[PDB]
């Protein structure tokens, strides 16, 4: 089917973007960190989105609530 | 927090927790070939960041 749609987050003075793409090796998630005039990103292949999500729950559960 | 790692194909992801005067942050580095990039996420948005990522995990198929 079509890919999930673009998403955005704002924190402090920077913006985060999430977009989905696909090539011959497959589907991936690009997470960009964009500031007024700086830009860097990471690229996560689909086959490890779950592994990623789990690491995050682990960090979120272990927060000083 | 502890700090973790993960391998996929030709890439390594590292998860490090750091701290400055303003508070705690999580830095996610990507290393492939011999290049590395990273994004850094302050604690105050870990939940929102988790949910957004989780929503993407909810859309996936087979
Ligand atoms: Cl998908």
Numbering used by the authors:
A (entry chain B): 191 to 255
B (entry chain A): 194 to 213, 214A, 215 to 255
Q: How do the authors describe this structure?
A:
Pur-alpha is an ubiquitously expressed, multifunctional protein that binds to both DNA and RNA and is known to regulate replication, transcription, and translation. It has been shown that Pur-alpha binds to single- and double-stranded nucleic acids that contain GGN motifs. Nucleic acid-binding of Pur-alpha is mediated by three central PUR repeats, which are N-terminally flanked by unstructured, glycine-rich sequences and C-terminally by glutamine- and glutamate-rich regions. Besides its ability to bind RNA and DNA, Pur-alpha possesses dsDNA-destabilizing activity in an ATP-independent fashion.
To understand the role of the third repeat of Pur-alpha for DNA/RNA binding, we determined its crystal structure. The final structure model was obtained in the same way from selenomethionine-derivatized crystals at 2.6 Å resolution. Two molecules (one depicted in brown, the other in yellow) of repeat III form a dimer with intertwined α-helices, very similar to Pur-alpha repeat I-II. PUR repeat III was previously suggested to mainly mediate dimerization of Pur-alpha. We therefore performed EMSA and observed that Pur-alpha repeat III bound with weaker affinities to CGG repeats and to MF0677 than Pur-alpha repeat I-II. Also in fluorescence-polarization experiments, PUR repeat III bound MF0677 ssDNA over 30-times weaker than PUR repeat I-II. Although Pur-alpha repeat III does not have a phenylalanine in the corresponding position of F145 of PUR repeat II, it also contains a conserved aromatic residue (Y219), which could potentially undergo stacking with DNA bases and support dsDNA unwinding. However, in unwinding assays almost no activity was observed for PUR repeat III. These observations confirm that PUR repeats I-II mediate the main nucleic-acid-binding and unwinding activities and suggest that repeat III might predominantly mediate dimerization. Since in the crystal structure the C-terminal end of PUR repeat I-II is located on the opposite side of its nucleic-acid-binding surface (bottom), it is unlikely that PUR repeat III causes steric clashes interfering with the nucleic-acid binding by PUR repeat I-II.
